[PDB]
């Protein structure tokens, strides 16, 4: 497991039923109808750079003792699609970032009328020196944040 850290597995319940794994070294992982997206999702509704999972160095609030957390890396899910995505219970519009916890099932597209639903389960097998792995530590904070020029630049690579 010197190449895979995170595992995004499209479930059978979704039009997709494959397993994609982000490499501890691949950051950010791009998702969208365009295979250019490190992750592959073919949904007529999905866009080229539908969304991407980006990794960042988790910063701690100092420590005048011996406590965990420290400074390591965290994986953020960055939605770039107009069709919006659903993560557990948090909405993310094209241009948002989100914390990805170990075993996080994210839905990129859900249509009731079409009965077609897409969702991937994030499973981290390897922890490339991750403060935890991505599920955070103490008081889970699952709130959607906005992206900046840094994020927009990442999608400008493919």
């Amino acid at each position: 497991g010197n190449g895979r850290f995170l595992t995004l597995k499209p479930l059978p319940d979704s039009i997709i039923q494959e397993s994609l794994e982000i490499q501890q070294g691949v950051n950010p992982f791009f998702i969208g109808r365009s295979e250019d997206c490190n992750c592959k999702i073919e949904d007529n509704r999905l866009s080229r750079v539908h969304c991407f999972i980006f990794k960042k160095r988790h910063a701690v609030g100092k420590s005048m003792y011996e406590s965990p957390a420290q400074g390591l890396d965290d994986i953020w899910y960055c939605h770039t699609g107009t069709n919006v995505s659903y993560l557990n219970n948090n909405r993310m519009i094209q241009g948002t970032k989100f914390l990805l916890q170990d075993g996080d099932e994210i839905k990129i597209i859900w249509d009731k009328n079409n009965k077609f639903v897409i969702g991937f389960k994030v499973e981290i097998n390897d922890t490339t020196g991750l403060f935890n792995e991505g599920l955070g530590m103490l008081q889970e904070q699952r709130v959607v944040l906005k992206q900046t020029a840094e994020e927009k630049d990442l999608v400008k690579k493919l």
């Binding site: 107009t82 069709n83 597209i109």
Partner: peptide, 7 residues
């Protein structure tokens, strides 16, 4: 085609 919309 950024004219999509979901319920």
């Amino acid at each position: 085609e950024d004219i999509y919309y979901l319920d």
